[PDB]
């Protein structure tokens, strides 16, 4: 009965600032986007050694996936996010919604393919200074600052 929603969070590009709660970030993502959907993916891709340990602890407690990538590796974070989004597109059929929390222009193709080749609704959560090529593919654009302030 419910369409799937997937969240793909590029933590190194949209990081939780010192002092702020990741639990409240997740809670606000769900409150703002998950109405009338079922969660089918929630993945947060980062090098966990570079992130605040309490942030990682809170994500673990939120029961979402913290996919660790050694940052010495290349485009390996971008690859993990692309892989997870392609897997979502191969698993689900429209109607479906994807929330990408990133600023990185290297996801433009993905956003386009998921929107047009799969018919998915695209939500881009981005910090200021986001790639306009990336922004053009989203159905709705939201500033990441809404999730990390009061």
UniProtKB/Swiss-Prot annotation:
Tissues expressed in: Predominantly present in oocytes and barely detectable in granulosa cells (at protein level).
Domain NYN: 5-142
Subcellular compartments: Peroxisome
Phenotype seen when the gene is deleted: Female infertility due to oocyte meiotic arrest at the germinal vesicle stage: ovaries look normal, but oocytes do not resume meiosis even after a superovulatory regimen of gonadotropins and are ovulated at the immature germinal vesicle stage. Oocytes display strong up-regulation of a transcripts, increased retrotransposon expression, defective cytoplasmic maturation, and meiotic arrest. Mutant males are fertile.
Purpose: Essential regulator of oogenesis required for female meiotic progression to repress transposable elements and preventing their mobilization, which is essential for the germline integrity. Probably acts via some RNA metabolic process, equivalent to the piRNA system in males, which mediates the repression of transposable elements during meiosis by forming complexes composed of RNAs and governs the methylation and subsequent repression of transposons. Also required to protect from DNA double-strand breaks.
Subunit structure: Interacts with LIMK2.
Protein name: Meiosis regulator and mRNA stability factor 1
Taxonomy of the source species: Eukaryota, Metazoa, Chordata, Craniata, Vertebrata
């Amino acid at each position: 009965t419910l369409p799937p929603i997937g969240v793909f969070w590029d933590i190194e590009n949209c990081s939780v600032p010192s002092g702020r709660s990741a639990t409240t970030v997740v809670q606000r993502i769900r409150e703002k986007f998950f109405r009338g959907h079922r969660e089918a993916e929630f993945i947060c891709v980062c090098d966990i050694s570079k992130e605040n340990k309490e942030v990682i602890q809170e994500l673990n407690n939120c029961q979402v996936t913290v996919a660790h990538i050694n940052a010495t590796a290349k485009n390996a974070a971008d690859d993990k996010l692309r892989q997870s989004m392609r897997r979502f597109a191969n698993t689900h059929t429209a109607p479906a919604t994807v929330v990408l929390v990133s600023t990185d222009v290297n996801f433009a193709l993905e956003l386009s393919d998921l929107r047009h080749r799969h018919g998915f609704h695209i939500i881009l959560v981005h910090k200021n200074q986001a790639s306009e090529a990336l922004m053009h593919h989203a159905n709705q654009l939201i500033r990441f600052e809404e999730f990390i302030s009061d």
